[PDB]
Structures are given as structure tokens and as C-alpha cells.
């Protein structure tokens, strides 16, 4: 039958309800006027319940602006309200319907994207929807202005172009901006094993270049680390890519160890017999970062399972990894130095014995041999992981901290361990205990600040002051920054290069005392 008796009431519900005149009112009005009936009382029903909420808002908003309160507060409040209503009431089906009625969204979308909050709205909408056509199109086009990983790896050509551009940005990033340039690429590579294998092979071929391919090899190892973080075993990838195929025993042994993410006396025994033979396989073959991290966590956490007949075998293989010089005569190992092996293995043995014994005062007893033996780099790393796991225990500072002293030997005597030590202390500078009060937390923080200022004195100055600026802008109270400046200007000698001033002085604007601060500011601005 005719739908007038029902559809006219459907439209009259939206007419005679409180306050609907300002809308789909045109569509329902057209349906009613084509359906006939009483169109004159429809307009009266629309305007009867017109409460004039809009002019009420005019009065209220212009009165808040009269009050001298910032109108940008009103802008933020309205934007937050409407954006939250959208997110709560967003329908992906209706987004795909907007795509269906026309492929490119009309100018309302291109007007919203000018607003940063709406761009973030589209980001949160589309980062979770890898099949909604409007959302996928918006995220991809905004990337053309996150590139969604599903449309990143949907084909070779898109993945390759975004890969090479992102890798260009990583290489442009030097040694700092990679933290932002690598994940967008790495998570793009870490979605499937075929995009993964293609990427790892391209970086392997690129790494053969002696004009910086070492950095491409570094980035490939980092991507493999991330692929492990996504729970995917790239052991056989590194095997068949590297020189594992040259030695099947080392291949299966190392590959099993990497696939588990743990060691074992069996594969270790295989490598021990190989490097005990007159033809030791390449030392580059075992020199893998995660593998050597397995050595650290076997030899320097409490435990693990260990036999004395294999303890020395683990130690000797790590010494071979850290010591032996193989000279390539066109990729031919012809000279094998093993003369700095026994001392390294002895130091590793003694330091590992101290570390698994769960040492404090006994550390100070044998600190002489320790600072004698931290000169070995691998030993310095082993002690670093040991003191990290001991000190990372919750409330390890209420009971002896001598451990923080040892970094002074490490970072001072090994330049390339500056990034680790600060990247250790960044956790320790965020220590918080309810037992050790905020006073003791601030003492420990100031001690760590003295350590970080010493590490700055060794040349690691850009990331130190950058992180100090960041956590002041966040966490770190003004007292800690003032103590930082006190110790710094008490220790650092002029001249002060502008690369250090550019971050140290515009954060020192908050304070003016520790007077050495006045001298520093006057010298560095003049």
C-alpha cells in the first residue's frame, strides 16, 4: 500500500520533535510535500519548537569573549567536543559509503585536513582500518602531503618507493633522527616475510659498498632486531645471506641459537670445536649483535643454567669473537691473530665469575682488577649489562650504590660506549620509589646528573642536552636542571661551541643562578 500513512509520520516525527528545523530536513520535507497532506502546519511545527539555541550561543560566546578569557579556549573546547562526538559516533560503513558516492571526498575533507586536530582524527581513524576505502585513501594521500603498512606492502612498487625514500631519510638522519625515520620504514618491512626478505637482500647488496654500506648493514641488523620484536625468526635469513653457507655446522648451530633467542651447550660446543680446529670459521660469522646479547644474558644475569665444562667454552668463543684478527686477502682469511685471545678470555672469566656470584663491598675489594679489566671492551659491556640488571631491580638504591661509579671507567675509557651509558642512565634518572622519598630520589637523580655531565665532558654533548631539554619541557623539576647547570658551569671550561649553547642556554633561560650562570650567558650571547 501507499507509505504515506507511515512515511509522513516518519517525517512529522522529525518536524514536530523539539528543534529540528536547521537540518535531511529538506529530503523529508520533499517526501512529505510529494506525499501531500498538510504541508502548511509542517512549517509551523518546524518553527514552533525553534528555541533559538543558536542565538543563545551567540549571546553566551560573545559574553565569554567580553570577559577577557581567551577565545582559543572556546575553540579548543568546541573542537574537542565535536571531535569526541565524531570518534564515539564514527561509522566505518558510512565512511565507505562516502567513498561509494564518490571516490574523492568533497571539499569538506580537504578543508578539515588544514586543521591539525582533524588530521590527527583521520590518522586515528585510518591507522586501525586497513580495508576501509575512504580511510585507506585518506591516510595514503596524507602521506603524500604514517603510510599504512597494508597499502605499503600491497605491491612491490609502492613498497620499494616508500622504502628507498625512507632509507634516504634514515641515512640523512645521521645517528639521531633514525629513531623517527627507522620505525616508519621498519614496521613497514616487519609486516610480512617477503617484503622482509626483499628488504634484507637489498640492504645486503647495498652493504657491499665500502662507501658507507656499513651503515646499511647496521640498519638491516636493526630491522632484523625489530622483526624479532614482532616475534618472527630471521635466523635463516642471516644464514643464507651471510657466509653461513660456507660452513653448514656453524650455519645450523648459530641459526638454531638465534631462532630460539637463547644459547645452548650443544651449538656452543659445535662452534667451540670449529674454532678449536686448525680452520676456524670466520669471526665475522659469529659477530652478530643479538647473539652476543645472548652471551651477555647467559653470563651476567643470575643464572642461567651453566656447566663448568662448558662455562670456559662459552667464555673462549666470546673471546674468539672479541679478539681474533682475520685479514681478508680479497675475502681470504690468510692472517689469523689469536695473541690477544687468552688475556681477553681470562678477564671475561674473572669478571663473569664476579658477576654471577651476585656481588657491592666485594666489588670495591677487587675494583683494582676490575678497572684493569674493563679496558677490554666486551668485558665492559658484560659488566654494563650486569650492573643494569642489578640496578634495574625496583628499590636497589636503598641497599648498596657503588655500581654507578663503574660507568666512569667505561664511558671515559671507551668512546663508543657513551651512547649506551646515557641510554642506561635515562632510565635511572626516571627512578621513583615510595620507600626512598622524593628527597632520596632527587639525590640519586643529581648523582646521575653528575655522571651525565661527566659523560658530556667526554664529548657526548648533543644528545645529553637534547634529552635534558626534553625532560625539562616535560618530569625533571627546575631544581634538577639548576643543579645540572651548577655542576656544568663548575666543570666545563670556555670556549663553549654554539652546538652546545643552542640547547644549554635556551633551557637555562628558566633560571639565572647555580655568579657563573651570568658569566656563561653573557659569554655565550656575546
Amino acid at each position: 500500500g501507499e507509505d504515506d500513512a507511515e512515511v509522513q509520520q516518519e517525517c512529522l516525527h522529525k518536524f514536530s520533535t523539539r528543534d529540528y528545523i536547521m537540518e535531511s530536513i529538506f529530503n523529508t520535507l520533499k517526501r512529505y510535500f510529494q506525499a501531500g497532506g498538510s504541508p502548511e502546519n509542517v512549517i509551523q511545527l518546524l518553527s514552533e519548537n525553534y528555541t533559538a539555541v543558536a542565538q543563545t550561543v551567540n549571546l553566551l560566546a560573545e559574553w565569554l569573549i567580553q570577559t577577557g578569557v581567551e577565545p582559543v579556549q572556546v575553540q579548543e573546547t568546541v573542537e574537542n567536543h565535536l571531535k569526541s562526538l565524531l570518534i564515539k559516533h564514527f561509522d566505518p560503513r558510512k565512511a565507505d559509503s562516502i567513498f561509494t558516492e564518490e571516490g574523492e571526498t568533497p571539499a569538506w575533507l580537504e578543508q578539515m585536513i588544514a586543521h591539525t586536530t582533524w588530521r590527527d582524527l583521520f590518522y586515528k581513524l585510518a591507522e586501525a582500518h586497513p580495508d576501509c576505502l575512504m580511510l585507506n585513501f585518506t591516510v595514503k594521500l596524507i602521506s603524500d602531503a604514517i603510510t599504512s603498512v597494508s597499502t605499503a606492502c600491497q605491491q612491490l612498487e609502492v613498497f620499494s618507493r616508500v622504502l628507498r625514500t625512507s632509507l634516504a631519510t634514515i641515512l640523512d638522519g645521521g645517528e639521531e633522527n633514525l629513531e623517527k625515520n627507522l620505525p616508519e620504514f621498519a614496521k613497514m618491512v616487519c609486516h610480512g616475510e617477503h617484503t622482509y626478505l626483499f628488504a634484507q637482500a637489498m640492504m645486503s647488496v647495498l652493504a657491499q659498498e665500502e662507501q658507507g654500506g656499513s651503515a646499511v648493514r647496521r640498519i638491516a641488523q636493526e630491522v632484523q632486531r625489530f622483526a624479532q620484536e614482532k616475534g618472527h625468526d630471521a635466523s635463516q635469513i642471516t644464514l643464507a645471506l651471510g657466509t653461513a653457507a660456507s660452513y653448514p655446522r656453524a650455519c645450523q648451530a648459530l641459526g638454531a641459537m638465534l631462532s630460539k633467542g637463547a644459547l645452548n651447550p650443544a651449538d656452543i660446543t659445535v662452534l667451540f670445536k670449529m674454532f678449536t680446529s686448525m680452520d676456524p670459521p670466520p669471526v665475522e660469522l659469529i659477530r652478530v649483535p643479538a647473539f652476543l646479547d645472548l652471551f651477555m644474558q647467559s653470563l651476567f644475569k643470575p643464572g642461567a643454567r651453566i656447566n663448568q665444562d662448558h662455562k670456559h667454552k662459552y667464555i673462549h668463543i666470546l673471546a674468539y669473537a672479541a679478539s681474533v684478527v682475520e685479514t681478508w686477502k680479497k675475502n681470504k682469511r690468510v692472517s689469523i691473530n689469536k695473541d690477544e685471545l687468552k688475556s681477553t678470555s681470562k678477564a671475561v672469566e674473572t669478571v663473569h665469575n664476579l658477576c654471577c656470584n651476585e656481588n657491592a663491598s666485594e666489588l670495591v675489594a677487587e675494583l683494582s682488577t676490575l678497572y684493569q679489566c674493563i679496558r677490554f671492551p666486551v668485558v665492559a659491556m658484560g659488566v654494563l649489562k650486569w650492573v643494569d640488571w642489578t640496578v634495574s631491580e625496583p628499590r636497589y638504591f636503598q641497599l648498596q650504590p657503588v655500581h654507578l661509579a663503574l660507568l666512569d671507567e667505561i664511558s671515559t675509557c671507551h668512546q663508543l660506549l657513551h651512547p649506551q651509558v646515557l641510554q642506561l642512565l635515562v632510565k635511572l634518572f626516571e627512578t621513583e620509589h615510595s620507600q626512598l622519598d622524593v628527597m632520596e630520589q632527587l639525590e640519586l637523580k643529581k648523582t646521575l646528573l653528575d655522571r651525565m655531565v661527566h659523560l658530556l665532558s667526554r664529548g657526548y654533548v648533543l644528545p645529553v642536552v637534547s634529552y635534558i631539554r626534553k625532560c625539562l619541557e616535560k618530569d625533571t623539576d627546575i631544581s634538577l636542571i639548576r643543579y645540572f647547570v651548577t655542576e656544568v658551569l663548575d666543570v666545563i671550561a670556555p670556549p663553549y661551541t654554539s652546538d652546545f649553547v643552542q640547547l644549554f642556554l635556551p633551557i637555562l633561560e628558566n633560571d639565572s643562578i647555580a655568579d657563573p650562570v651570568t658569566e656563561f650567558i653573557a659569554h655565550c650571547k656575546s
Binding site: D19, Y20, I21, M22, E23, S24, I25, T51, A52, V53, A54, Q55, T56, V57, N58, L59, L60, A61, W63, L64, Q66, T67, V69, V74, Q75, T77, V78, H81, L82, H89, W108, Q111, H115
Partner: protein
């Protein structure tokens, strides 16, 4: 709306009546009475497409922005330099009293009148004249009319005093006898808990002129009735002012200390040493 130069519904129907292009006139009226930000004039069709009318986000921001306006009325009462803050509140009063007739800006203006010690009395006169304003008006608005003229004070204390005598007569004539309790068991502070004298204290607040007014009106009825009820109500009003720790009456009244002593006397029902 015309008080500050804005149109009303009759002007809208004039804009529609006898027009060859009523639709464009309606659109022009909508443009003239919209919220004036540049982002909205494009977003209004888009948000209208959802099935959400423009009035709905207007309602949300209406609640939010009048809440902040009331917050800022209280702030400017308590914030800013004195001349500037009172100038701001009086100017906002002149803006807002045109819409006290509307259902939005009554209590905002009532707070503004609450936080000014004195006002041009035309608006206080309208507050008493109109029953809706006579209800919703804040306490100090009523105090200002009473402090400026005693008509409303007498008009409202007469029924309250009639109710007090109603309570006295009804309680004194009640037909219960027991070893358990009688009607003289409550102490005077027990009897002050009734809303009659407490609301009378609210009506007086901390003002001495209204104290003199209640004193005189109780004096007149005590002189005509020969009844101790109005005496008791003066005592209750004084000690309810003391219950609020009203220093404006308690420290200046020589009777306050003595009635406070009499309160303990009545509580024990003896005058101990």
C-alpha cells in the same frame, strides 16, 4: 533581542511576509543569527548531513559557555582590581538584564547582583515585582531591596511569623502525656533547626538594618499580642546569627553574650553559679 540590536521572530516573519523570494530571505536570516566563526559556515552543512542539526552542537556549547560565564561572574566578583572588576560586572549587568526575561540569563544576573553591595534599584524593584524573579533571586538581591525599603520584608515575614505562631499554638495544644517526653524537651538550639528562623537568618544574613527590621516587627506584634512567641523568635534569630558566627550582630549586640549564656541556662534548665 532588539535591546542590543538583533532581530526577533516577528522580524523573521516580516522578512518572510510579502516576499517573492522567501527561501533566500530565510537563508539570510539564518546567516544573520548564526554563530560567527569562519570554520562553522562550511562545517554547518557537513554536520547537518549526519542527522545532527546545528542547534544540537549549539545546545552543547550553550551549556558549556553559560557554565563558564557563571564561573567568571563569580571570578570577577573575586578576581581583578576592584574598580575594573565592579565596572565589568555592572557593564555585563547592563548587557544581561535585557535577557533576564529570557530563561537563560536570570541566575547569572542574580549572582552579579549578589556580588555588588549596591545597585540602581530599578532592577531590584523588578525582582520584587515579578514572581519568577522573586523566587529565583539570590539572597543578597533580596537583602538589597530590604535594606533599601521594608515593604517586601514585612510582606514575607508576616506569613513566616504567622507560621511560627501556628507551630507554637499547635505544639502547645497537643494531646500526649508520658513519662518519656514532653514538648518542652527540645533546647532552643533544637528549635532553631526549623527552617523558619534559619531562613529568617538567611534573609537578614549579616546586615544590621534587617536585624533592626525584624526587631521592630517582633516588637510590634509582641506589643499587640502579649505573647512570648515573638520574644522566643528574637532569641532564636540572634542565636541562629551566632550559629553562622555572624560577627556583624554578635560582636556589636550587647545582648548576644547574655543570650548565649541564657542558651546554656535553658539547656540545663538552671542558672548554675
Amino acid at each position: 533581542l532588539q535591546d542590543l540590536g538583533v532581530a526577533n521572530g516577528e522580524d523573521l516573519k516580516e522578512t518572510l511576509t510579502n516576499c517573492t523570494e522567501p527561501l533566500k530571505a530565510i537563508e539570510q536570516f539564518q546567516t544573520e543569527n548564526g554563530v560567527l566563526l569562519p570554520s562553522l559556515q562550511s562545517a554547518l552543512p557537513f554536520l547537518d548531513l549526519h542527522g545532527t542539526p546545528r542547534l544540537e552542537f549549539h545546545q552543547s556549547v550553550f551549556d558549556e559557555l553559560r557554565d563558564k560565564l557563571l564561573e567568571r561572574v563569580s571570578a570577577i566578583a573575586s578576581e581583578g582590581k576592584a574598580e575594573e572588576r565592579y565596572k565589568k560586572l555592572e557593564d555585563l549587568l547592563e548587557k544581561s538584564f535585557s535577557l533576564v526575561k529570557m530563561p537563560s540569563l536570570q541566575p547569572v544576573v542574580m549572582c552579579v547582583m549578589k556580588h555588588l553591595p549596591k545597585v540602581p534599584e530599578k532592577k531590584l524593584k523588578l525582582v520584587m515585582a515579578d514572581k519568577e524573579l522573586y523566587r529565583a533571586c539570590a539572597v543578597e538581591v533580596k537583602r538589597q531591596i530590604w535594606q533599601d525599603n521594608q515593604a517586601l520584608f514585612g510582606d514575607e515575614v508576616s506569613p513566616l511569623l504567622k507560621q511560627y505562631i501556628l507551630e507554637k499554638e499547635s505544639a502547645l495544644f497537643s494531646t500526649e502525656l508520658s513519662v518519656l517526653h514532653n514538648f518542652f524537651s527540645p533546647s532552643p538550639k533544637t528549635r532553631r533547626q526549623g527552617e523558619v528562623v534559619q531562613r529568617l537568618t538567611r534573609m537578614v544574613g549579616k546586615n544590621v538594618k534587617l536585624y533592626d527590621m525584624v526587631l521592630q516587627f517582633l516588637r510590634t506584634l509582641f506589643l499587640r499580642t502579649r505573647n512570648v512567641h515573638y520574644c522566643t523568635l528574637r532569641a532564636e534569630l540572634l542565636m541562629s546569627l551566632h550559629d553562622l558566627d555572624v560577627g556583624e550582630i554578635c560582636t556589636v549586640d550587647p545582648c548576644h553574650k547574655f543570650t548565649w549564656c541564657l542558651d546554656a541556662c535553658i539547656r540545663e534548665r538552671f542558672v548554675d553559679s
